[PDB]
Amino acid sequence: VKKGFRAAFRFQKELERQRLLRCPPPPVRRSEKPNWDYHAEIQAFGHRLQENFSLDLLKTAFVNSCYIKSEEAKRQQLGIVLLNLKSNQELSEQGTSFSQTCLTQFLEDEYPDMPTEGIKNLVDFLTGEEVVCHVARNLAVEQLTLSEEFPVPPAVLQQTFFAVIGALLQSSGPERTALFIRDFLITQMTGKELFEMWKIINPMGLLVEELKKRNVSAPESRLTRQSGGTTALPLYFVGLYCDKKLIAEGPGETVLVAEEEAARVALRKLYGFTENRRPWNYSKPK
Amino acid sequence: QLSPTELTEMRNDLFNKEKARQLSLTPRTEKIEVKHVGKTDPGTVFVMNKNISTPYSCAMHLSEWYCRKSILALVDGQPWDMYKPLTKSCEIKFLTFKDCDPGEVNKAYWRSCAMMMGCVIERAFKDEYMVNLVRAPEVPVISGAFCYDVVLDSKLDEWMPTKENLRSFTKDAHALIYKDLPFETLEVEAKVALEIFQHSKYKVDFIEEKASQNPERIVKLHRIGDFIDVSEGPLIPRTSICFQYEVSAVHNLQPTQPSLIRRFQGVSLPVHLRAHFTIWDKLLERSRKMVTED
Amino acid sequence: ISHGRVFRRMGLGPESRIHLLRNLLTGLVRHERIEAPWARVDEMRGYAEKLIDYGKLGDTNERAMRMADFWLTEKDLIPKLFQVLAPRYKDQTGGYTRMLQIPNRSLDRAKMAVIEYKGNCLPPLPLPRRDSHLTLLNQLLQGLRQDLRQSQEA
Amino acid sequence: TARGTPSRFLASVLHNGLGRYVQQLQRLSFSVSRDGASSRGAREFVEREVIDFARRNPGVVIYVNSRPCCVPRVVAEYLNGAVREESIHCKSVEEISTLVQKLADQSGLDVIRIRKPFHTDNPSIQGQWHPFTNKPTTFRGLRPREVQDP
Amino acid sequence: AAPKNRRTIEVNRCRRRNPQKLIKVKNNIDVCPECGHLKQKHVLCAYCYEKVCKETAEIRRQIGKQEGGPFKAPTIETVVLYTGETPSEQDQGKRIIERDRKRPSWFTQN
Amino acid sequence: KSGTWWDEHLSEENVPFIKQLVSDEDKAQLASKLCPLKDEPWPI
Amino acid sequence: LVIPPEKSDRSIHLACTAGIFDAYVPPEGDARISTERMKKTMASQVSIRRIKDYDANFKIKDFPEKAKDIFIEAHLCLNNSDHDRLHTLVTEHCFPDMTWDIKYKTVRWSFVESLEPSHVVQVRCSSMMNQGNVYGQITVRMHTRQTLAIYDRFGRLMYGQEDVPKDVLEYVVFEKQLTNPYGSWRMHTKIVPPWAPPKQPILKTVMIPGPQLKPEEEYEE
Amino acid sequence: ISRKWEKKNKIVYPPQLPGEPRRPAEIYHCRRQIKYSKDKMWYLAKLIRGMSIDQALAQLEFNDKKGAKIIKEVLLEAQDMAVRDHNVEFRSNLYIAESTSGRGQCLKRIRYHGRGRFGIMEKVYCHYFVKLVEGPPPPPEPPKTAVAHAKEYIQQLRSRTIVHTL
Numbered sequence A: 001v002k003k004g005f006r007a008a009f010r011f012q013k014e015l016e017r018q019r020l021l022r023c024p025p026p027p028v029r030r031s032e033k034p035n036w037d038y039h040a041e042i043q044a045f046g047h048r049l050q051e052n053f054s055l056d057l058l059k060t061a062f063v064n065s066c067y068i069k070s071e072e073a074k075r076q077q078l079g080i081v082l083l084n085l086k087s088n089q090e091l092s093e094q095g096t097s098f099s100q101t102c103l104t105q106f107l108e109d110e111y112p113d114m115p116t117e118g119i120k121n122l123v124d125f126l127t128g129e130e131v132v133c134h135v136a137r138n139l140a141v142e143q144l145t146l147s148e149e150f151p152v153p154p155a156v157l158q159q160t161f162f163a164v165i166g167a168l169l170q171s172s173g174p175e176r177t178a179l180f181i182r183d184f185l186i187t188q189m190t191g192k193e194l195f196e197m198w199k200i201i202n203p204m205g206l207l208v209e210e211l212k213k214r215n216v217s218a219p220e221s222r223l224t225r226q227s228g229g230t231t232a233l234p235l236y237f238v239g240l241y242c243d244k245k246l247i248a249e250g251p252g253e254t255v256l257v258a259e260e261e262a263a264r265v266a267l268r269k270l271y272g273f274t275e276n277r278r279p280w281n282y283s284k285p286k
Numbered sequence B: 001q002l003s004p005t006e007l008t009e010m011r012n013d014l015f016n017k018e019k020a021r022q023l024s025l026t027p028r029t030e031k032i033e034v035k036h037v038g039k040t041d042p043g044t045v046f047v048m049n050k051n052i053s054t055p056y057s058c059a060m061h062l063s064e065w066y067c068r069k070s071i072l073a074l075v076d077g078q079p080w081d082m083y084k085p086l087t088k089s090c091e092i093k094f095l096t097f098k099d100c101d102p103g104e105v106n107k108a109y110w111r112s113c114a115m116m117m118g119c120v121i122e123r124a125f126k127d128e129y130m131v132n133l134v135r136a137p138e139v140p141v142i143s144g145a146f147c148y149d150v151v152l153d154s155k156l157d158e159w160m161p162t163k164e165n166l167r168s169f170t171k172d173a174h175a176l177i178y179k180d181l182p183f184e185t186l187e188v189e190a191k192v193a194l195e196i197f198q199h200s201k202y203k204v205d206f207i208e209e210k211a212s213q214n215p216e217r218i219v220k221l222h223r224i225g226d227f228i229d230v231s232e233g234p235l236i237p238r239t240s241i242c243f244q245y246e247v248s249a250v251h252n253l254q255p256t257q258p259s260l261i262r263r264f265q266g267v268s269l270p271v272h273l274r275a276h277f278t279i280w281d282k283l284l285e286r287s288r289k290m291v292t293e294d
Numbered sequence C: 001i002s003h004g005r006v007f008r009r010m011g012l013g014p015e016s017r018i019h020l021l022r023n024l025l026t027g028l029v030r031h032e033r034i035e036a037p038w039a040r041v042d043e044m045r046g047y048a049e050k051l052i053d054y055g056k057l058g059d060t061n062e063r064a065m066r067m068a069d070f071w072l073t074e075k076d077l078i079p080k081l082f083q084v085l086a087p088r089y090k091d092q093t094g095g096y097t098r099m100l101q102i103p104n105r106s107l108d109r110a111k112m113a114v115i116e117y118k119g120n121c122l123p124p125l126p127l128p129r130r131d132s133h134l135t136l137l138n139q140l141l142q143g144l145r146q147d148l149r150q151s152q153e154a
Numbered sequence D: 001t002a003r004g005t006p007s008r009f010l011a012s013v014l015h016n017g018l019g020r021y022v023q024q025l026q027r028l029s030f031s032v033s034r035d036g037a038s039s040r041g042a043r044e045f046v047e048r049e050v051i052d053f054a055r056r057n058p059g060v061v062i063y064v065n066s067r068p069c070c071v072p073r074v075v076a077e078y079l080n081g082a083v084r085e086e087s088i089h090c091k092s093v094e095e096i097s098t099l100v101q102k103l104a105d106q107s108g109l110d111v112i113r114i115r116k117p118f119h120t121d122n123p124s125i126q127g128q129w130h131p132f133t134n135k136p137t138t139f140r141g142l143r144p145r146e147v148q149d150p
Numbered sequence E: 001a002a003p004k005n006r007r008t009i010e011v012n013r014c015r016r017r018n019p020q021k022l023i024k025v026k027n028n029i030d031v032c033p034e035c036g037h038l039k040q041k042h043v044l045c046a047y048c049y050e051k052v053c054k055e056t057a058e059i060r061r062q063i064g065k066q067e068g069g070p071f072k073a074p075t076i077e078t079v080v081l082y083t084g085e086t087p088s089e090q091d092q093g094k095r096i097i098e099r100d101r102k103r104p105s106w107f108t109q110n
Numbered sequence F: 001k002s003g004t005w006w007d008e009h010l011s012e013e014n015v016p017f018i019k020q021l022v023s024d025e026d027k028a029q030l031a032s033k034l035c036p037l038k039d040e041p042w043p044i
Numbered sequence G: 001l002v003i004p005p006e007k008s009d010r011s012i013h014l015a016c017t018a019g020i021f022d023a024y025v026p027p028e029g030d031a032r033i034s035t036e037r038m039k040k041t042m043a044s045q046v047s048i049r050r051i052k053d054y055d056a057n058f059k060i061k062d063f064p065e066k067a068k069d070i071f072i073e074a075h076l077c078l079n080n081s082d083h084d085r086l087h088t089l090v091t092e093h094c095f096p097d098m099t100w101d102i103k104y105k106t107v108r109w110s111f112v113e114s115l116e117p118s119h120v121v122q123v124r125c126s127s128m129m130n131q132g133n134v135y136g137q138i139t140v141r142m143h144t145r146q147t148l149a150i151y152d153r154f155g156r157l158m159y160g161q162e163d164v165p166k167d168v169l170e171y172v173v174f175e176k177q178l179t180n181p182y183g184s185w186r187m188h189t190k191i192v193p194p195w196a197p198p199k200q201p202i203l204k205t206v207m208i209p210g211p212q213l214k215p216e217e218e219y220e221e
Numbered sequence H: 001i002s003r004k005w006e007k008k009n010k011i012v013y014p015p016q017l018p019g020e021p022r023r024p025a026e027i028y029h030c031r032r033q034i035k036y037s038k039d040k041m042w043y044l045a046k047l048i049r050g051m052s053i054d055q056a057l058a059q060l061e062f063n064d065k066k067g068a069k070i071i072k073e074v075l076l077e078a079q080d081m082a083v084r085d086h087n088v089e090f091r092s093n094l095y096i097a098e099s100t101s102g103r104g105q106c107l108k109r110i111r112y113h114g115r116g117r118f119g120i121m122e123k124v125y126c127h128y129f130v131k132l133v134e135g136p137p138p139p140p141e142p143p144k145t146a147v148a149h150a151k152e153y154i155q156q157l158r159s160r161t162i163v164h165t166l
């Protein structure tokens, strides 16, 4: 046995880190952890986003129906009205409607050549659970969300996110909210390809119909390039020709795959979603 | 009438429905006492669950050797499928291919090979042509081949299968073996069986004959995968028991005037009794000759 | 190199090998069934077969009596050879003994065999039996045989 | 060393700075001691510096906790969920000011090797090079030594 | 000659765990039909063999008592008779060894 | 999965029969080849 | 060792007996009802007086209500393995029987209803000063609906059902240490009538192994 | 010394919900201070590793090594322990999940050499550990096929980027 306390204390700290690593504790809400002041956190949320929220509306946006029904069950169990807490349902609906119309206007103005189906799919992707939940989690929405279950279910988090948009729309109006949707949802298209967000099948079928609408001859598929035809790693470039004029060209490992890619390339050009299109303008409106 | 795919779906639903009904007719987990009367492990008693526990479950209590070697069960002196639920307190013995008198085991394996042939024949012809399953004649094992009487479409009245076609039936049979499907059994009343096989005239006549033989008019149904047929007796536990299996010959039975019944023939040996390549070839040749049930 | 070398190297040399085998053979004549290492029983089995042939020559053949005197170290067994064992095999030309492998010896895991003179009074060994003629394979072959015999007579 | 540690690609949190800049530092938790020489510099930071630092950063909620402790610490939490703990033991007021300002400016991503000092989602405007980019085409796409119309 | 260097555990595992060093699975094991215990195809069942040996030893002990000394091997054949049995016609002139038990079912009188 | 050999499962009666059967087939097959020039020989 | 060291002044202080002083055999057909009567009653009255001797303020009428409370709370300890409280509610003879077989099992038991009021069937006392200690045993009859769902070590249902109430007729015997100043009434044992209906079947199938015979031995009918 | 292996049979899992699947039973058992080498015992524990309870007992019954008779004895009493104590319905529905050996406490003795020299011999002891799991033996992993090799090779050719550039 060696004299001293410092080394023993240091080793205890290390033994506690390894124990925790071996058995990671079940996660809990940030509110349940120390150093939490809900009112202060609500005010910081607006200030971070440079938005003049109304603190009454903003707090209601976070309140979910599940949290209210559960809060009442606990009250009944304890034999304890003062719980006239308004849910975010109304704000959620208002925010959801505005976002879809606002996103549809942003996208229709920028890409006038996309049909309604394409724009709808893009709005559904931008307002989908996966995208919205990612943005909400990284904006401290989940920390401020009052829910029955933790981790917050994705549907619940999506509803809360749009409730915050509803609060902003009432507080600041449509123009200020439109900038918010541009800066946190439209940005989620950065780097994305058209058909990564708009999932389509039979691109050649869609292309033929679009060219018919445009009174253009049906595209003839031709082999522009070929390498390794008889090997296990072929390369094919299939070009689509309308009136013996090249509209699109696509690579592939098979002629069928190359042809389908060429159709997708043609659709991207027709709709104005080419990789080299003019980037979205985020500059302050004049 | 119903399409071939729909007919199977109808028959399976009726089979499943009847299976569920019989299961409901047991009060919770009643217990039966099954005494082992075999030469080995003498005196072992199994306290099993009525209408759920099968002879295979009793073998599982003993060892894996019983499960692998036991092909048929002898329940109160009566041959009993390994997967047939035990219904009463009784005595049980296990039968193998290598018993001193494996006559009952041979018949059980002999009948199952015919039922596997019926399954492949029904599912082999193009949808254009109509295949009507008739019966699996009970032919002695010494005859050298098992046979299954089929009636084909009028269009195929001058067609005789080629060697490549016979090999195609064999490859389908081996695919059934590879699937390792259990032989599921159901003892249902004539009425239930007649509903399942209403579309087929031969089965209705066959079903009626079996019901008449028994006072209670209960008919034995078996199923492998999605194929349901009516059987003469207990079958083997699984299709994986078969190791060497080949559809040898198809004969046209006489008289041909009323209807052209085609006797499909095959021969097979289990894993336990697999024969050498040379010996197997000699058996295939005799299997290709016509057998006349007596 | 040991091409065509039919005898094993046993004991402490050629003489000891014979003595080792002789003790085994003497035990067999008395008890009519003994267990010993498989290799040693296999070596001794040949002598046990030939001893009977000498016994069949009879007790009046002086050469047979000398052979029996050497190989049987217990002299009460010499009358047994000539008057019990050899008469028992009067109607056979060979195959007087049966040798079967038994489970390995516990101590040193030596491969073991049991050897006995056929026709003894002892409880029978659990001999290996071929499959019944009633098995599936044997019945299919019986059919093939029946069929081949019928076609030949025609 | 690089091989002995993890790495990541240069990135941002929710495309920060593209539409608007959002400060990633979300919370600061100080743990000072009323008594203790280790916290002398931390006590003086709470008297004159912390109040003026909060005025500039209204989006950061600062939690000052005075309690007995041998090692005063500041715990920084970021919007992406990262938590960083930095000891302020025996640091001067100016040293603490510098550290706290650095925490405010960081994104919260792991301070590990960055493979590339740049990131782009649209590296090519004219078309990424492929083996046929600079190859000429031939009449009827005929291959080398290929008989046509045989 | 002495090792120039320590051999690593990595090298040693390759040598020790080479399939040549591993125990091979036996495929010739089967169930004894008489007793149900396991046996190898080419070797007698240990359970059945022991049973035979135990009865053989009892008979040999009885033979000892009848002989009552060394060098007293009989010059006639021998038969073993169990409780409730009497010498047959073909058992006359043979030494009778009497066992105080019932004839085992596996020991068929011949 | 256990290995087998030709007479493993054969009964006492069938082993002699099989031996004779295969033996005769071998002899018959060898006798059938004794006239190469009467069986469509290749050009000499 | 069965007995502690020899020639020691200190001895083991036992707080309970091992058996019922006079086992109460319930009349046949009692499930249907759901001179000797006086003789048994007189013996109970005699014994009741020696119970009221040490403890003056004792009421037989109140016991069946108290007995039910002891019973319910004792069984509820099995659900949460509250052994410390159980020792107060049951004797040392009862405690091993209740808990030993459920050490690595989860027992979910509940009390639903009492079909018939509890009736003190018999009251009896031990022979005076067995070792300076006098015990009083009060047999009680309980007809109640209970729900039991025992689980195994892996959380798999092993016995009973967790929602179906079933009728239980059991005559619980209680016992107190009258001499001990801190003696209390504590569940001592349960009387199982021979005519009692067989318990509900277990879920799993069982195999009863036959005789393991050595090679010399043979099987007999 | 450590004796954690005996404490794993005392874990009580919470009752399962109605929709959850049947949980397999796990039975831990071992034997301590076996007069045998752990290196020699390892070859026997490696043999039955993954086998069924009835297949392992058959392989150990015809093995000539001394450790075989010991492991088989440990398996027989773990099989009975499973059905009797751990609520296992069928005794044959078990397979060897884990089976390894461990070093025991050993004794040191002198080994006399010539020229007044000596060595120290360890009197070796080992432990044997086994874990039984209810159910059939997991099917062996089929060997990698040519289709999987090609599918993996082409996947690496598709995952390669342009390195050290934009």
Ligand SMILES: [Zn+2]
Pocket (backbone or CB within 6 Å): E032, E033, E034, E035, E036, E037, E045, E046, E047, E048, E049
């Ligand atoms: Zn045996």
